[PDB]
Amino acid sequence: QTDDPRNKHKFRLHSYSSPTFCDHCGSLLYGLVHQGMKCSCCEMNVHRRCVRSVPSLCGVDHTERR
Ligand SMILES: [Zn+2]
Ligand SMILES: [Zn+2]
Numbered sequence: 001q002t003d004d005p006r007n008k009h010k011f012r013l014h015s016y017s018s019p020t021f022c023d024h025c026g027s028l029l030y031g032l033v034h035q036g037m038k039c040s041c042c043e044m045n046v047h048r049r050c051v052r053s054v055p056s057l058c059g060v061d062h063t064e065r066r
Contacts, residue, residue, distance in 0.1 A: 012039070032047040
């Protein structure tokens with residue numbers, strides 16, 4: 001409850017109203033997730049079974065020159 005580890009994206013199913021499209025398959029998030037699993041670290045919407053297919057590449061930010 002103090003050390004911050006690092007694993008795959010922190011996908012988290014949110015709730016807006018309609019399901020968003022998937023970024024791994026490009027298919028609406030229907031019959032797969034209540035709404036959509038948005039990564040609470042880099043902002044990445046995916047399905048509930050497409051995460052096991054993602055190579056886990058979280059930590060993609062901008063302004064990395066310095
Ligand atoms: Zn991410
Ligand atoms: Zn998907």
